[PDB]
Amino acid sequence: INSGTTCSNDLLYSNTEISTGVCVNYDLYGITGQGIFKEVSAAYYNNWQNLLYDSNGNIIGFKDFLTNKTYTILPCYSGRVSAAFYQNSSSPALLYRN
Amino acid sequence: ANAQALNSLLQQLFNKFGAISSSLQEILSRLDPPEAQVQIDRLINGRL
Amino acid sequence: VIGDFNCTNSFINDYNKTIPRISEDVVDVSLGLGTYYVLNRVYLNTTLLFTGYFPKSGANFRDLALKGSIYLSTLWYKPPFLSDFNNGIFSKVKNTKLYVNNTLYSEFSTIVIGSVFVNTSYTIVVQPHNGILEITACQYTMCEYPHTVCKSKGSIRNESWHIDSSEPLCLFKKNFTYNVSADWLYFHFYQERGVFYAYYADVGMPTTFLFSLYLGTILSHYYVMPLTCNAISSNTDNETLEYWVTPLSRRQYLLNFDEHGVITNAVDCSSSFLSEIQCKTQSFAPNTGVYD
Amino acid sequence: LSGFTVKPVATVYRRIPNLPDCDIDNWLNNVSVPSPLNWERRIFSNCNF
Ligand SMILES: *[C@@H]1O[C@H](CO)[C@@H](O[C@@H]2O[C@H](CO)[C@@H](O)[C@H](O)[C@H]2NC(C)=O)[C@H](O)[C@H]1NC(C)=O
Ligand SMILES: *[C@@H]1O[C@H](CO)[C@@H](O)[C@H](O)[C@H]1NC(C)=O
Ligand SMILES: *[C@@H]1O[C@H](CO)[C@@H](O)[C@H](O)[C@H]1NC(C)=O
Ligand SMILES: *[C@@H]1O[C@H](CO)[C@@H](O)[C@H](O)[C@H]1NC(C)=O
């Protein structure tokens, strides 16, 4: 017990279903991070390629080996609000840029 | 010249500065809290 | 000596010279020979400055073929046939295609990577078969004189390089396929921070990824098993076995990817003065200026 | 003001296996039912079930 090399796949294969539109973490092939997914038609993957990277070294897509589908990972929104407040007011005016 | 300065500073988040990796999520997922502060301190002192 | 377990005491011939002949060609990376794709990454219409383990340009190989006969020897299992796996090796095997009984069969030697070659350690064995490549890294029991036989037109011996009752605690077991009607094969093996990598190709200059395994031990030994057969002699077909090996080292390279994701050009940053400028500006057509 | 951050849930995990499956369903569905006197035994190791 708690030894050897014969384990079970009753934990990692829980849902095996991914969404497209919400932000969630991922551990795809040892790569950790957060992002938003989006289905896209891609035909540049090979039999040994599963991740897509840019020159800077960031993952911008992947390919699932269980459904043969291609996606695109985009950074999730993390911004900052600029508010202006008067001398003796009660609530400042908010402005979300862009 | 302004674009090169912003892209050079952005690549500083991928350096290790002597740590085991560059992502803080990987450090906090493979090491215990007591021995994890020594790796995060190298990333904070390097990015600052 | 490879293992620490006596397995056979058959006929042994005299220790001949068996000079490790040196190839006459050199490594050329102008088209892709020597470089490899990333593990599972895709690059499109970009240029990448990869800092990995690549062979040095302008270097010769060394043959390690040990095609045996009805007899064997004890010097074959001794240096320099057992080199040091310091950082990695680069293989270039000839696809020995036979036509016995009007059948096209592809067989060649194997490669064994280990540290002490005992039961308490892990031994990586890559043994090729008829149209199928097998890779297993378990805790095998290496023999003192390991060898492999040929399927088509078998020898007067029997393949025996490990003896066990049950399968040990293995860490990797998977099969791969390759083109039977090929001409040359290429491989890549190296280590980095403990983990192990492997590559393979059958057509084209670059290679493809095979697997990535974590071991935690620093393996520093590799040996190629002989091939005992009676079909590649002088009286038999004139086919000869070839297994070239050249050391690898950590060096910078500049890869070019087209709009589809195929490596087109590659340059070594420590070859000439012009290549040093290309790796500094990350472009194959540098501008006009003075560079230090 | 301070940056607004959220904590996402429902992580995704993907990994390529390195060991073949045990394949016990095909062995248990054998057409040859052994007698209680035979009780043939097969050992499974280094596999996934
Ligand atoms: C990979 O290929 C090898 C070679 O064909 C397979 O080993 C065979 O297994 C069957 C079933 O146990 C035996 O009848 C054959 O004799 C084996 N061949 C040899 C050359 O030993 C192996 O099963 C395949 N799969 C894996 C996971 O290794
Ligand atoms: C994905 O495509 C490959 C090659 O066409 C095929 O072997 C595999 O079965 C496909 N996957 C699924 C889930 O159908
Ligand atoms: C590839 O990059 C070059 C240089 O930026 C550009 O001119 C060309 O349009 C790109 N091709 C594609 C298919 O994106
Ligand atoms: C195998 O190689 C032969 C010639 O070398 C070629 O005609 C054939 O298309 C190749 N097959 C594959 C699957 O690559």
UniProtKB/Swiss-Prot annotation, chain A:
Native organism: Human coronavirus HKU1 (isolate N5)
Organism lineage string: Viruses, Riboviria, Orthornavirae, Pisuviricota, Pisoniviricetes
Function of the protein: Attaches the virion to the cell membrane by interacting with host receptor, initiating the infection.
Designated name of the protein: Spike protein S1
Glycosylated position list: 68, 88
Residues of the full protein shown: 597 to 694 of 1351
